[PDB]
Structure formats: C-alpha cells, structure tokens
Amino acid sequence: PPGPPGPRGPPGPP
Amino acid sequence: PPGPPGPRGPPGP
Amino acid sequence: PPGPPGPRGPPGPP
Amino acid sequence: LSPKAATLAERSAGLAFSLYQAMAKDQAVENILLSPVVVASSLGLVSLGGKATTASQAKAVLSAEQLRDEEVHAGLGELLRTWKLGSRLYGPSSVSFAEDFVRSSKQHYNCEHSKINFRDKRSALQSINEWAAQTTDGKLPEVTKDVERTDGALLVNAMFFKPHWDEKFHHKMVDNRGFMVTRSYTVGVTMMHRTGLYNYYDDEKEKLQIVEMPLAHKLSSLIILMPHHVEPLERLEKLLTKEQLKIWMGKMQKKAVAISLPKGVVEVTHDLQKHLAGLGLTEAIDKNKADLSRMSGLYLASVFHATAFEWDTEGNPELRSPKLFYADHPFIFLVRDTQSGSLLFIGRLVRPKG
Amino acid sequence: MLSPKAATLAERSAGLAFSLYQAMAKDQAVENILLSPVVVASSLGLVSLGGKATTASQAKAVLSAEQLRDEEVHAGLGELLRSLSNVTWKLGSRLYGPSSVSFAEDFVRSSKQHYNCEHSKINFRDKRSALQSINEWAAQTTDGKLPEVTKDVERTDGALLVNAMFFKPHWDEKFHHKMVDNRGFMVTRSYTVGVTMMHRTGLYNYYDDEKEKLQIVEMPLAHKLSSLIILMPHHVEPLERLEKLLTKEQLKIWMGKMQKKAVAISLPKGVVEVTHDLQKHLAGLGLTEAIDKNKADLSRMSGKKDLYLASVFHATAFEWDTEGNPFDLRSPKLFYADHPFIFLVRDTQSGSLLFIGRLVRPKGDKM
C-alpha cells in the first residue's frame, strides 16, 4: 500500500 | 509506493 | 509492504 | 484530420483563447469550462440557420468569412465527430423548425430539436435539466435555475468530460487537503497525488509552473498552468496566448514531477449569449435584427454551454527528487489533441465544491 | 566490561568530546562534525608519552587525567582503543615527522604497544608527495572509504598526528535494500541538496519535545550492544539552538522521557567524510606548549626539542547504509531527517560514547 503523507512544508518567507 | 507529499507549510509572518 | 513516506510538502505563501 | 477539418480546427482554437479571455474579464464568472469545437459548432448552427448579416457575422466570429458554407459545416462536422455530448435547440411552442434545417443540423452538428412552453417556468426548466441529466447519465443534473429570455431560441449544449490518464493515479493516493481560493479563504477538498516523468517547465521570471499530462495512448494531453503561490489568475491570463503557449511547450522537458490535484466533478454552466455578441455576433442575439428564417418562425436568446468535468485517479495501468506541482490554488488548464494540436477544452479552477 | 582505569578514562574522554564538539560548533568555519572520544583521548596520550614537563602534563590536563599515573592513562586508553574493535570499524594512527627527524626506539616501542601508533619520515618540502603518502595510508587503513585526509600541509617543520577511521553502524533491524530513493536535503531554508534517503518503520524509543521544538530517536545497533541516537529540530534551522541544550545531563532527561513508539525513520544514505585538524581546538582547551615551536618539548619522541605538534588529523568516513540484522504501527510518527541533525553512538553496557557528531551538509549537487 502507498506510504504515509510527507512532513509539512517549510513556513513561507516574511 | 511513496506516500503523497506533505501539506503546504504555514504562511510567512 | 507499505511504501516510504511521501516527500516534504510545498513551502507556505510569503 | 482531413484538410477541411484541420483548417477549421485552428479557427475554433483561435476563438477558444478569444472567448476564455472575454469570460475571464467578467467579474461574476468563477470557474470556466469551454469546449472550443462545441462553441464553434454553435456559430455554425447560426450560419446554417441564418441569412444575410446574422449568418455572415457567425462566419466572421469563426474567422471563416472567406470559406464556403459547405466547407464550414463539413469541417466542423468532422471535427465534432470519456466524452458525453448533447446539443439541442429549444424554440417556443408558437414556432416550427424547417425540415431542411432539421436534416442538415442533425447531419453536421448532431443537433436536436424541441418545442417548449414557458407558461410554466418550472416545467420548462424541468425539460432542459432532465434532457441534460440523461445526456450525461446524471453527471450534469442541472443546467440553469432560470431562463431570463422566454421569447427566443435556446441553444443548449450539455457535456460530461473525464480525462483518462496515460499513467493512472493509485486509487488510495487520495486524501483531504485545503484548497486556497485566496490567501485568506481555504476550502476543504479531496486531492489525488502521483509522481512520474512529465513534460515540465518552471518559469522563475513569470513565477509560474506548466505541466503536460498525457491522456490515454498519448492521443491528447491535459496541460496545467499555475502561479507559484496563491494569487488571482488575472496576471497569468495576460500571458495566456496561443504564441506564449508554444514558447512554454518548447521550453518544457521530461522531469520527475509529484502532481497533486483536486479530485472531483466540476460543474459549470455558461450562457455564451453576451460573450459571443462581444466577439461580433450582434444580429443573432437581437430580437428586432435577427434573421433565423432558415430555421423558420426567432432570435438567439441563450447559448448554454454546460459541463461536468471530472478529475479522477483512473487511467491506463530510478526517478530524481521530484519537483512539486501542488495544485491547491487557482489554475488554468487546456486539453489538446496531440496530432492536430486542436483544443478539446480550455478552462480554469478558481473555486471547487469541497 | 571496562576495568576501573578504563571506565574513568571513558567518562573523561566523553567530557572532552562534548567540550570539543561545543568548541568546534561555535566555529563558523566548521560544517559536519565527527568525533570519536577514545581516539581524541589517545592523541593526548601520545603527546604525554612523547613529551616532557609541561608539554606532557598539559596533555593529561586537557583529558582531566593529571591526577592519574602515566601507566594508568596508557593502559586505560589502550584497553578502550581495543574495545572499539571487538568487522566494519577501521582505525589507524600514524606520526609523520620531517625527514630531518629520527624517532626514539623506546617511544616507537611503547607507542606501538599502547596506541598501535605507526611512524613515518616525510619530505614536507615536496607537498604533493607528502599529501600522496598521507592520503594513500589513510585510504589503505579504511579500504578506500577515506581516500583523502587533507588538501594541504601548511608547515614543513612540525609533527603531523593522523587518525584515519571508518565507521558503519549496523542496525539491529535492517532497512530494506529497496526502501531507498532520491530526496532533497534542506541545508538551509533556501539551499537544498539532492540526496539518497533510506526509509524504515519500526518500534523505536522516541520523544518529541514540543516545548524545545525537537525530536529524539534511539536506533539500536546489532544485538543491542550499542545505539545510535539522533537529535533534530522540528524544522530547518541552524544547530546552534539545539547545541545550547546539548549537555550530558539534558541527554539523560531526554533518554528517560523516551518511550517505544511507531516511528517512520527517513535518513540520508551514503558516506559522510569529515577531516578535522584538532590542533587549534585542543590548544584552546589547554594543549598550548605542544603546538608552539619555541615551547614544545617532544624529546621522548625524537631524542631532542626539534619537534612540535603542527596538526592532529581526526579523519572519519561515517557510512549511513541500509544493512543491519535480518530481523523484520498503523499511524507512525515521522522522523524525516531532511535537515541538519546531531547524533551520538553509545555502548549499551558501559555507556561509553563511541561517537558524537552532526550532519549539516551531505555530499551531492545543489537543487
């Protein structure tokens, strides 16, 4: 079966 | 198969 | 067997 | 494929960018779903059923003024001939369609004919909606909630389109994600995900990504244009031309791309009436000026172009660190025939159902 | 089981390793760190063995072994060095001196006996041939895993102490050879390098510190004789913040707070090659006389005061591979190591630190 989702993306620039 | 990409990161300050 | 985790998500908006 | 069809194909696609742009400028419009060939066939029906300026303007909007009527109708007929399509002309009960037009409109445009009484607005809407639901096997259960013009002819196009990928998404690569309509408004959607080798280009100067997704047996492709981050499509739409598309296509190269797309049915109904008049079809739309005597009895009240476009995982049954094509914000898409380059669809997703 | 001498020397070598890691982590010119505490301590042991007066006494002081007899330090360090190799682990120690020098028989004998030290005469004036000898010796010691130690020998007149190592942790539960793919490693928020990553889901001792925004995982090595521990912040950030929290005491707190949980561990796969010249860092810790040409007394090594310690090469090829014991959960926690992290390798029985380090920049091209 497909793996779990990846980690959350980095925060956006200020 | 590899899992889906993770969710979008939070917006910048 | 389960697949590897997915890649990191996209960066947040600026 | 044939000389007539190929020559008529470029014209129908030239009108696609023209119509999409006019609709994109209208502030009331959210999602867009246009079939260039179907739009072109509506102009052909007006030329087929009209006389003098009413019919000459139809050929002009098609850029087909210098072509014979026979070439236009045969060329469009061939072009036109999962995809469910139905085309029906509704006329008031006080009208009678001519035998010659019925025969030719069926032969070229697979056009259907019906008499309708607006005395009961509910029963008239019920007829149109039921006809659309049967045409699309329930995928498009409703066309419109109102008929603003009850004294004219109602041209109704009902369609169901489901792109079948050349390389299918895994049925379990589906989950819940947030779709950013704006920077401040997020809608809960279902997204489907896949990683594979795709023709791709990331324009760092114009801050956009373009990906090509081949459809079954590489006969056609679904192309997606999206800005880097959430922003209204107005900026990208200025760049969207037939010429700029060619430049982008040539700059594309096969790369590992992790494509994430909203999964579901997008239902859109457009009334092409005012937009085609803005493109030059002024006489056909005007009760006092229209000459549709070849159909007999009056004027073109509405040109409903209604579509149920389904984004599903289904398709035909190492790579480097992939580039993300994470479609969680508004995007533009086109469906293009590989051989001819003819546009099957042009549209945009600005706000999904959820 | 360590004897009393070796147990206190192990604890002393670990204290030193923490101090060295911290010193080197402050240095903006340092990227990846790879330190073997026992090997670092053995460098101080050789300086003491070959030195006289303050040159030798400072070497014992840097190791906090000044109140121990010379025999206790040499025997203790010998026992610990041998415990490092009791298959994949590879170690070599070689003293290089200029051609104008001659090593004393007594020092050669005892440095071989306690430290397994090798000795070589080298023409430092011919820079290419000198680099060629050192790198070929380092390459053979590690069977090609470490083919280069240094790209320069800046000084022709001193002694060069060279430690060349190969370490490959063998997981108690191996990664599947096919659970390997290409991923991006985020060196910074703006710089990504193309890496190969290995993935496995299992039951691992884990703790997620939500207060200090970090995750800690324990990965047992073969037959649970040792463990590899990884400390990583929640997101990409320089390691400086986590390094402030990194103490022997804070590690014990974290270890105790850990519990066995379903963890999907993703790690970069490959060989990390790091060469440190510890000369300045050891000098900063108190080894001042040995490195000073005008002050050094290494007369036990060479018969006279013609020698000073020019460099102390601590060179390691650390391999992150899928291989482990052929042994082997619904919603696992992710330990996705695609950004800089700290790691330690600890013996389970003794608690002795085999390694302390950090991965800030792996090999590969910028994407």
From TrEMBL, chain D:
Main location: endoplasmic reticulum
PROSITE patterns: SERPIN (PS00284)
Keyword Transferase among record annotations: no
Function: Binds specifically to collagen. Could be involved as a chaperone in the biosynthetic pathway of collagen.
UniProt GO molecular function: collagen binding; serine-type endopeptidase inhibitor activity
Species annotation: Canis lupus familiaris (Dog)
Keywords annotated in UniProt: Acetylation, Chaperone, Collagen, Endoplasmic reticulum, Glycoprotein, Phosphoprotein, Signal, Stress response
A Pfam family recorded for this sequence: Serpin
Family: Belongs to the serpin family.
Stored InterPro entries: Serpin_CS (IPR023795), Serpin_dom (IPR023796), Serpin_fam (IPR000215), Serpin_H1_serpin_dom (IPR033830), Serpin_sf (IPR036186), Serpin_sf_1 (IPR042178), Serpin_sf_2 (IPR042185)
Serpin domain span: 17-352
Name recorded for this polypeptide: Serpin H1
A cellular-component GO term for this protein: collagen trimer
Gene: SERPINH1
Location in or out of the cell: Endoplasmic reticulum lumen
Coiled coil region boundaries: none
Keyword Endoplasmic reticulum: yes
